Symmetry: C5
Subunit: 273 residues, 5 copies
């Protein structure tokens, strides 16, 4: 049938269908996703007063991000279950178009909150040295936006036009590297003039940041990481994508936020952990 | 097919249908919309105590507006997905009337909260000089209401009766200019007798106000901004409209609110920024 | 078609149908309704500490009322859209009985919260002189209940049995007048021994109370206020009814609550307006 | 139609159907139910600080109960409207089995929260004299559970097996009397050594407790209180049952909680009424 | 019918169907489940300040767990009612595949929150002696994850491949024993150097922990605990499973959390129990 500029899930769903395990796992992992986020929201609110006033914007922005991620991951969980329906005769879930086609683009546009705010929020915990606060912020936000928007365009074509897919993906990748560059700078300047404890945390944060954020382009490419007609262009690839998103999401948002909160505590004049 | 006094989305949806990208983007952008608003709600609540008591009503009214905008943008997101359904044979989303016709009027009536409160809330941060508080408030609220109501009538006719569309739109425009007039006055008087920092912010606020509020009549006209049978009388126009609303909404509500909060901090005896 | 003891909306919906504008407006105005209430809830909670402890129960009861009204107006918004479905052939929304018949009775029973609490809450702001607190409360609550219950019975018959409609309506009206009587007493005793500012507010409150509460029996009668086969026994009447309810609801609950809060501030030893 | 071990509502719904008034009222009264509970939740949270620390657990447990009752009464409201659908030809609502059969058992299992917590919470306000706190608590909780569970079994058979219905009901009744016994003791010991004001409240509480709790077995029996083929084995009985539950629910939970809160205030060293 | 790697509920549902009592009870018990959790959330938040600051993370993590469990138990309640639909002709609820197959796997992945956090949270109340905080945490979290993941795989095969079911189950059991081991250690070291009161509570906690956590593998095995074609491979088994989960859930999460909170109070320098 005619699907157009649609994500590859819909093509697997339309031709092969999804096994019980594939369908159910994808459902479960998204559910866990949004559950984590709402739990995180509660955590971050409830721990605001654990750090000095000046650090508390970090907690607030964590919370802001949790709201975004919850809403999206919740919405997307429902989108999954609507888009694919059990066929009794063969015993697999197939594309149910009355439910709309499944699209990962929901995530992308919601990153226009998540990404800016996640990058922003560190600047409230660490002190810069040679770099200017506003300058860093603006670079983060610009490159962030450009990264997302270009990627957002790309992913529409991941099946329909593999060239556009990769080119847009490439362009996106450029801006991603820019962000990585700037964040490294930030983390180094952050380490300057703070206890060894805080420096250890920032080291961890950087590793977390680097891995977790890298997963996202991983998910982008997921169906094609085993080349043409590969293992991953399958229900197995579908599962993998949503798993990776969920790991990325938990890492890049919740754990990131927790570490920052721990950093803020060390840097806090009253407070101890 | 008889549609009557219906928005142009329904006509595009009924004749041409929407591509994957068009349908999905519109869906995504509204989702982002309401996500932003609920995140904003949390922000504004959580930052109430960042400013002196006398300023805190600004935070509260921001919050009030966020609730309104969330509920509406959420409701409207659902309305979009209900009103247009995938047709397998051609691979486009077409008007599904069992879901009701799509209408932008939801926004308009909900502005009867948003507009009054947004205009009101500045009067709790800035001090007037030559203008009377009650006088400004009453002018805002009257012209606000008249603007919205006349526009609300107009938009029902954007397809069915182009004349009514434009005339009502014109009348609305009058009241809009009145508001612009009064807000300018407010901003100027606001700048009098406050730090240069606060004056810079109010300068920014005015630019934000002017652009963001102007987008709304832009969205009004969107289908016809490329004239008859133009580029924008199409799924491309539909997308554009909802994008512009979302940019307007985020600018005029969230960012506006944030700037005011920053102003309130500068004006605050305790606090610095 | 056999509808029985049903509200007149269902008869208009079943015979003539509703135009786009009629259906959409009714939908919009209810949406605005419940939006206002949830915004109000936030306001009243967030402003508790703006008045002296003894007054804060007024804020709490406002909040209680907002919860009720939100839930109801939300539920009723959904009931509207479920009860009437677009017919493609003629281009009007007709009764969809699979969605249940539309009934205004939802409002009425929910008044068993709203009315008692709204009458109650003033007694926490004003001081009585010659009247006993418990006595006033009991008169309010009794007459309130009797008003609502009798009206609730009436409205089931507004089409099926015009006599029952009017008789029950009459009986209700009696109890309504009793309430008006007692509230006037309260307002006068309230004015005794308080500043001219507070007296001005109570004057306004009384006018608000009188008009806003009177709208409700206005809505009761709405289909018949232009007599038989009148202008208002039509989709135009349907719109009018729900508009009037929404104006009444906002006036009698939110604005009422705001004014009381303003009164409480004047009467507050610390605080000024 | 084979219905089996189902509540009598489903039998009325399946044979006679429900009139507009019957269906709509049942819908309204459940809606009011859950509205009241959520309003109560807000109240009890918002008034925590109105009593001395030692009493505040009463407020918290009230709140706990409100959450339970809201969720259930909400869920049950939706169950009602799903289970019965308008038939156009005769103009009555009939059993719609695609919506599941209606069952009152939802209430019962949720009492496993409500009952224990309601009995518990008084023990935080009154001081016992003769009796041991833990001892009373354990008797309450055991007899509570046994009451509910036996009743829960009973009500499945209220149509299918009248004998089982009554026997289980009887057994339940035993445990109920035990609770009444213990609560009386508690209330008497509570009155010992406190002001006459507080003693008056506890007198009221006991009357409230006794009536409100007794309604519940009243609702159990409701269809059969006018014997076989009686007035109440009808849509009129259905209405009655849900009305009685709602009165019971509001009395036994909200009002009960309010009175306890008032008692706590009198007993409070700081505070006065 | 072809069901594949599906839970046994779906097989009972597809062949025998569920009686009124079976279907309704399963529905009720899940509803009670999620009700309990949301009530718990409120409790744990509202009692944060009953213990010394250092203990309050226990309250917060309890709360985190409640959010998770609520969302899941809620989602699963809805999944139950969607997956099984009344058949009029025979009067039983049968598998409705348009609702998706029922799967218990939702629980399992959500344990990836619950388990880590429940194990973690004790380490904020007790002081270790010979064991290292980080060491215990890491063992808990690793073995926890491995337990869940292996079990999660197992349960997909509980019908389709009894061998895989048991093997994976066995592997899981290994990791479970490891956790039991570590928790015992923790409890003993916890008891060292604290009051007799605190020691009593930890004794209770251990018993609670041991029983409640053991129920979960009980539920795993439930359909087969009466061997082949046993009593429990039936609607009776289905009921039993969900009952056991609910008991487990309330015990292992809510009561566990309460006891820890009580412990924290005894250990609290300010406060008394
Ligand atoms: C700016 C980057 C725009 C890159 C867009 C790529 C266009 C493209 O790939 O066109 C393929 C062609 O249609 C045959 O496959
Ligand atoms: C598409 C645009 C994305 C919208 C971005 C955030 C929405 C959530 C609102 C949170 C606003 C945070 C702004 C902020 O953090 O500013 C701190 C302030 O400047 C120091 O006092
Ligand atoms: C301040 C209050 C505004 C009062 C009246 C505005 C009347 C505006 C009505 C404009 C309707 C124009 C119209 O309907 O056009 C005529 C014809 O149908 C085209 O083909
Ligand atoms: C008070 C609201 C007034 C409502 C006024 C509605 C006027 C609508 C209008 O302008 O008429 C256009 C139509 O095409 C002409 O037949
Ligand atoms: C962004 C919105 C502004 C206008 C949208 C830009 C035009 C649509 C972009 C596009 O991809 O056009 C292809 C077609 O609309 C679908 O396949
Ligand atoms: C078109 C694409 C724009 C999308 C994201 C930009 C992210 C920026 C949104 C953040 C808004 C918060 C804000 O404006 O804060 C100002 C503050 O004063 C600063 O220090
Ligand atoms: C007590 C009031 C009862 C009024 C009943 C009523 O008005 O009945 C009208 C009659 O049925 C018209 O034919
Ligand atoms: C049957 C329909 C009737 C439904 C009505 C119940 C309203 C529900 C919740 C409001 C919470 C209860 C509010 C009661 C206030 C009583 C009060 O405030 O008196 C003590 C005061 O606190 C001294 O300080
Ligand atoms: C103690 C448990 C005994 C309670 C069980 C009662 C069962 C019952 O009432 O059976 C009636 C009889 O089967 C009518 O034909
Ligand atoms: C058919 C039944 C009709 C139902 C509608 C009837 C109205 C009842 C409304 C609220 C009751 C709330 C319970 C409050 C009871 C305690 C009131 C109280 O204690 O009085 C205030 C006190 O004097 C100040 O400190
Ligand atoms: C320790 C962690 C993983 C163990 C890895 C080994 C996994 C062993 C799984 C055994 C299995 O899957 O069983 C096959 C089934 O019996 C065919 O009929
Ligand atoms: C992660 C590895 C997935 C393990 C699943 C393998 C399995 O146990 O499948 C049973 C049997 O081999 C298939 O019919
Ligand atoms: C909480 C969400 C986060 C941190 C999202 C991060 C997203 C990215 C780092 C996306 C990166 C991409 C590329 C660099 C290539 C493909 C397109 C993107 C946008 C997925
Ligand atoms: C948060 C929502 C806001 C700030 C809405 C503002 C709306 C306007 C400024 C609307 C203006 C209009 C015109 C001036 C012409 C066309 C009709 C309107 C109402 C869209
Ligand atoms: C917030 C809701 C309020 C204030 C509701 C007030 C309702 C009334 C004043 C109803 C009055 C009625 C009559 C006096 C005649 C017809 C029957 C009623 C109940 C609508
Ligand atoms: C908030 C809910 C409450 C207070 C529920 C109370 C329930 C009862 C007192 C039930 C009593 C019953 C009998 C004594 C006989 C029939 C079976 C029961 C459980 C309905
Ligand atoms: C709040 C949820 C909790 C405490 C869940 C605990 C889950 C377990 C202890 C699961 C144990 C299992 C086995 C040891 C064997 C079968 C597979 C599992 C995962 C059910
Ligand atoms: C293309 C999207 C534009 C991104 C906006 C980020 C610019 C940063 C401006 C911030 C000024 C405070
Ligand atoms: C799923 C494992 C991650 C795949 C790594 C591929 C990332 C490519 C990033 C390009 C920049
Ligand atoms: C739809 C395009 C409208 C953009 C308006 C830009 C605002 C300019 C006001 C200065
Ligand atoms: C003292 C105990 C009195 C309690 C009254 C309970 C009556 C319940 C019966 C149901 C009401 C009759 C409806 C027809
Ligand atoms: C099966 C019903 C279990 C009831 C749990 C209700 C959830 C709220 C938990 C409150 C626990 C109350 C104990 C307080 C004692 C602390 C002093
Ligand atoms: C500072 C905190 C350090 C935490 C370390 C704890 C690590 C626990 C993470 C568990 C990851 C388990 C990976 C399982 C691999 C999948 C194998 C499944 C068998 C088929
Ligand atoms: C850097 C990673 C990008 C690798 C691109 C792999 C190219 C895959 O190629 C595509 O594989 C699909 C899956 O079977 C086929 O259906 C398509 O016809 C084919 O174009
Ligand atoms: C200020 C901007 C208003 C300009 C009005 C443009 C006139 C549009 O003209 C309209 O275009 C529609 C779509 O192309 C056609 O379907 C209509 O028949 C036509 O009247
Ligand atoms: C206080 C105002 C009450 C006025 C009562 C007027 C009764 C109107 O009369 C009614 O009008 C309906 C609508 O046209 C008709 O359908 C009814 O058959 C007719 O009885
Ligand atoms: C304590 C009060 C218990 C009285 C129970 C006796 C009434 C049982 O009467 C029942 O009435 C039903 C409908 O009316 C009939 O369908 C049953 O056949 C009949 O047993
Ligand atoms: C306690 C853990 C081991 C239990 C293994 C019991 C073996 C169950 O055996 C299974 O029972 C099903 C239900 O009757 C049958 O339908 C299957 O054919 C059979 O494989
Ligand atoms: Na599905
Ligand atoms: Na759709
Ligand atoms: Na509709
Ligand atoms: Na129905
Ligand atoms: Na069902």
């Amino acid at each position: 049938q005619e699907l157009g500029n649609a994500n590859f899930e819909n093509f697997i769903g339309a031709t092969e269908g999804f096994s019980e395990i594939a369908y159910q796992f994808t459902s479960h992992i998204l559910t866990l996703g949004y559950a984590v986020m709402l739990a995180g929201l509660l955590y971050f609110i409830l721990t605001i007063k654990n750090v000095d006033k000046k650090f508390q914007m970090s907690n607030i922005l964590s919370a802001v991000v949790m709201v975004s991620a919850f809403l999206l991951l919740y919405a997307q969980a429902q989108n999954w279950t609507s888009s694919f329906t059990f066929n009794e005769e063969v015993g697999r879930y197939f594309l149910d178009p009355s439910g709309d086609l499944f699209n990962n683009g929901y995530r992308y546009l919601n990153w226009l909150i998540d990404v800016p705010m996640l990058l922003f929020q560190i600047l409230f915990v660490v002190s810069l040295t040679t770099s200017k606060f506003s300058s860093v912020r603006n670079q983060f936000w610009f490159s962030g936006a450009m990264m997302i928007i270009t990627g957002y365009i790309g992913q529409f074509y991941e099946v329909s036009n593999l060239t556009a897919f990769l080119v847009w993906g490439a362009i996106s990748s450029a801006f991603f590297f820019h962000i990585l560059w700037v964040m490294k700078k930030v983390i180094n300047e952050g380490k300057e003039g703070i206890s060894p404890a805080g420096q250890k945390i920032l080291s961890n944060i950087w590793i977390l940041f680097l891995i977790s954020w890298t997963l996202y382009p991983g998910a982008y490419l997921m169906p094609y990481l085993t080349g043409v007609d590969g293992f991953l262009y399958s229900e197995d690839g579908v599962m993998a994508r949503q798993l990776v998103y969920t790991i990325a999401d938990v890492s890049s948002k919740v754990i990131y936020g927790v570490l920052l909160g721990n950093l803020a505590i060390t840097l806090s004049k009253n407070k101890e952990l």
